[PDB]
Design a protein around this ligand. Structure first.
Ligand SMILES: C[S@@+](CC[C@H](N)C(=O)[O-])C[C@H]1O[C@@H](n2cnc3c(N)ncnc32)[C@H](O)[C@@H]1O
Lengths: 128, 178, 262, 238
DNA sequence: TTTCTTAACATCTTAACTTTAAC
DNA sequence: GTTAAAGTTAAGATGTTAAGAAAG
């Protein structure tokens, strides 16, 4: 019987490829291949940034980069990524919340609803 | 341009072409470090973006010939060599560069011509000590150059990082001024 | 579209060179029973360019009465013959590693290879319209070179000559080059990069290994352009510095030591 | 320079907003399932060959495919020039010594198949030797003739002749005469466009598809353009 | 004293880019 | 205001060799 190439590829990538190249299910991670080498935002990086948003101060990316990250991440990268989380293009109004991690999705949904009502969806980021 | 591909392919020069100021800085720099010391030209830093190949070809264009080995580790005046290469008529050139259409170079002829060019076109110690290269600050990103920081080879992330760095530079400049 | 007027342009420029005859001193003719077991030191010395025009009896050629690759190890190229120079040889697919290994055993070192890419004469003629004697092949070559603009609308890949071979169909011939140093103090003069390592040529499908006239001229001109001091200038050089093995009995190159198998 | 500086700051903020919106659109596309150019059935390995555990590759290939690879494509990072050249080619990747390319367990990775190792003119002889001492019989050579976008020959530079082609040496190891491998196919010439530094033609892959249809292949030195279906690819920038 | 790495060395072609004369 | 027609530049998977870092 001929070998199923999709299943064979899934098994090979799950067994012996990197965590960024493959996924938990074994499907190919297109996100790693649509970004430059080294400039990839792993889910671990996003989880670390989400931890540092309310573990540390929003805006003080020196402390978040040195402590929560390994000190090898761009400050502009971190600011842009938390802009993605907050759903807004200006995190200046949200400087230093530091209350709890369990409502970041809540303010994201609030910004999404505001953009939908004010016709400022703009690829899931409310324009301010 | 496709930014998804690997960095090994599509080698570029960042800075595309040679300007008047850049060629004047190269003329000044070849007279202090010497022709051929491209590592020492770039290491001190006066060519923001030019590769070794660009500086090599620009030196060839400056002297009017591609026989750069006659000026290896040697500081001379660029104008006289260009004048003497433009003066002679029984030569064949492409891109205004004189080509050795005769025999291949030899090791002894190299030393003899190096000594001869040092004697003829060489500069004194006063002219060597007179030249001053533009001292660029080492805490400066790609300042201004809105047509060179908006490069297709860069991603959106890299372009935005450059823009934020430059914006912080004007912020620091206004803080110093104010 | 296919730019065949440029890859085949050399056929309109490289004129074949008339032989200088044995009576004149511009060329030397050497007749031996077989070349690979002949002491070639008496036929020349201080050589610079050796061109073994060997046709190999490979299994791909359909019994064309060539040369065994095992007999080349019997060749004797001493330091007296060539001290610092370049050897040019014809190589096939299944004996390429054999040639390289035997040359490395001789004292030579691989430097470069020069490929002739083959365009089918029959395919080109078929695209123009829609056993062959050598004069008919030459006439058809002239016809296809004259009416090449009409051939500009056909893709190159549909004009390539794909000949029988067990693994990948043959479409090229290869001329390997090897270099002998001897003593690094004496340097062999060269004109580098003066012609490309790949050329395009229309050939017949019967035996593309045997390169005809007006194509051996391209290889000759590449050899003389690569080695300028290897040319025989009459009156100021004593001995010929260029030598061909397995040369034609009618075309003696003016400036070469031709060795004929007879 | 104050009013001009204010205008420059306003233009910088406008470009910041524009590129921020572009980045947001790109990453929203990525989050909402943006298919990349590499096909689904590819195995990209981002590892250094001197430190890569090839035994993992062999064990998983036996566990999943049931047979070793039928074709190995190699285009090694030869020592030719540096990343900052003075005169010519500008090879922007880490060179490997010939001993390191020799030390790969290629003989322990294949049982019957084809090596497709690319070579340069300086490393042609050592490529033949590498094929020889890997237990293989060099039998074929495919010349990729580089083509300009207009249709000419993309002539490069050399020391004896102007290099305008690349040689991929193909060797066999064992049983090929069985029905898996097709004989007398394709051609030894790839007249195709030069589309990047050390960028091999796409057509060679189809030639492999014409040689061993529906087979397992491995690319030992591969970049992000070398991923294909049914191809295991290894590299340091994958 | 011997060898190993880096930099710099020329002899070439073609497309892309830039500049310029002409309708 | 375009247009086609030269200059110009970088890019290309060269081998070789003088000049030291490094082991004697
Ligand atoms: C010549 S490139 C392959 C290019 C490919 N043929 C194409 O068509 O794009 C070989 C790659 O091997 C990678 N490489 C270099 N050194 C390596 C090492 N030590 N281990 C693993 N991969 C390495 C580099 O990324 C280099 O670009």
């Amino acid at each position: 019987q001929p070998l199923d190439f999709t299943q064979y590829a899934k098994n090979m990538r799950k067994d012996l490829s990197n965590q960024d190249i493959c996924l938990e299910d074994g499907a190919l991670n297109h996100s790693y291949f649509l970004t430059k080498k080294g400039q990839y935002w792993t889910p671990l990086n996003q989880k670390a940034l989400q931890r540092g948003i309310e573990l540390f101060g929003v805006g003080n990316w020196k402390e978040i980069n040195y402590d929560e990250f390994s000190g090898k991440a761009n400050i502009v990268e971190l600011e842009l990524r938390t802009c993605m989380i907050l759903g807004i293009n200006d995190i200046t109004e949200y400087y230093g919340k530091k209350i709890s991690e369990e409502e970041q999705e809540e303010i994201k949904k609030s910004n999404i609803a505001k953009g939908k009502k004010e016709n400022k969806l703009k690829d899931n980021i409310y324009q301010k | 341009f496709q930014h998804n591909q690997s960095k090994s392919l599509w080698n570029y020069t960042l800075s595309p072409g040679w300007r008047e100021e850049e060629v004047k800085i190269l003329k000044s720099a070849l007279q202090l470090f010497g022709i051929g010391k491209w590592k020492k030209i770039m290491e001190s830093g006066c060519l923001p973006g030019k590769s070794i190949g660009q500086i090599y070809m620009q030196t060839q264009r400056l002297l009017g010939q591609q026989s750069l080995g006659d000026f290896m580790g040697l500081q001379i005046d660029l104008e006289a060599v260009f004048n003497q290469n433009m003066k002679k008529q029984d030569v064949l050139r492409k891109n205004n560069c004189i080509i050795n259409t005769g025999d291949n170079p030899t090791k002894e002829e190299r030393k003899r011509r190096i000594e001869q060019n040092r004697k003829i076109y060489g500069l004194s110690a006063k002219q060597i000590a007179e030249i001053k290269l533009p001292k660029v600050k080492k805490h400066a990103p790609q300042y201004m150059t809105l047509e060179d920081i908006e490069n297709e080879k860069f991603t959106n992330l890299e372009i935005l990082t450059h823009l934020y760095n430059l914006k912080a530079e004007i912020v620091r400049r206004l803080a110093e001024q104010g | 579209d296919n730019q065949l007027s440029l890859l085949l342009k050399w056929r309109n420029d490289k004129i074949p060179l008339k032989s200088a005859s044995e009576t004149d001193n511009k060329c030397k003719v050497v007749n031996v029973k077989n070349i690979f077991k002949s002491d070639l030191s008496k036929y020349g010395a201080n050589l610079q360019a050796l061109f073994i025009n060997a046709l190999w009896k490979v299994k791909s050629r359909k019994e064309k009465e060539g040369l065994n690759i095992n007999d080349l190890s019997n060749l004797k190229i001493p330091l007296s013959l060539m001290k610092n120079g370049i050897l040019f040889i014809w190589s096939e697919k299944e004996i390429l590693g054999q040639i390289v290994e035997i040359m490395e055993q001789k004292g030579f070192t691989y430097i470069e290879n020069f490929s002739i890419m083959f365009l089918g004469l029959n395919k080109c003629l078929q695209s123009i319209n829609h056993e062959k004697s050598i004069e008919q092949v030459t006439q058809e070559k002239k016809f296809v070179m004259n009416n090449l603009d009409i051939l500009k609308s056909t893709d190159i890949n549909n004009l390539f000559l794909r000949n029988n071979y067990p693994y990948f169909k043959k479409t090229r011939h290869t001329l390997l080059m090897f270099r002998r140093i001897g003593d690094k103090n004496q340097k062999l003069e060269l004109r580098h990069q003066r012609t490309s390592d790949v050329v395009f040529e229309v050939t017949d499908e019967q035996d593309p290994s045997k390169v005809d006239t007006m194509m051996k001229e391209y290889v000759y001109q590449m050899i003389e352009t690569l080695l300028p001091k290897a040319q025989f200038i009459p009156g100021v050089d004593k001995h010929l510095k260029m030598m061909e093995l397995f040369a034609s009995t009618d075309n003696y190159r003016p400036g070469w030591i031709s060795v004929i198998e007879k | 320079s104050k009013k001009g500086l204010q205008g420059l700051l306003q233009d910088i903020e406008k470009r910041i907003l524009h590129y921020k919106q572009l980045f947001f659109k790109e990453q929203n596309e990525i989050a909402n399932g943006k298919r990349s150019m590499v096909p689904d059935n590819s195995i990209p390995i981002c590892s250094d060959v001197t430190k890569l555990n090839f035994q993992a590759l062999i064990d998983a290939q036996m566990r999943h495919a049931g047979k070793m690879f039928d074709v190995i494509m190699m285009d090694p990072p030869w020592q030719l020039s540096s990343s900052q050249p003075s005169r010519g080619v500008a090879i922007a990747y880490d060179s490997l010594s010939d001993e390191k390319i020799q030390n790969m367990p290629i003989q322990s990775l294949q049982q019957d198949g084809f090596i497709f190792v690319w070579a340069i003119n300086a490393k042609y002889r050592v490529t033949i030797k590498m094929i020889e001492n890997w237990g293989y019989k060099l039998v074929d050579e495919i010349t990729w003739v580089k083509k300009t976008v207009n249709g000419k020959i993309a002539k490069g530079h050399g020391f004896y002749l102007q290099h305008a082609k690349e040689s991929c040496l193909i060797g066999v190891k064992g049983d090929v005469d069985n029905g898996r491998f097709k004989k007398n196919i394709a051609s030894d010439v790839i007249f195709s466009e030069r589309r990047g530094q050390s960028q091999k033609p796409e057509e060679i892959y189809q030639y492999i598809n014409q040689l061993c249809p529906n087979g397992n292949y491995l690319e030992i030195f591969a970049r992000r353009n070398n991923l294909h279906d049914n191809w295991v690819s290894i590299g340091n920038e994958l």
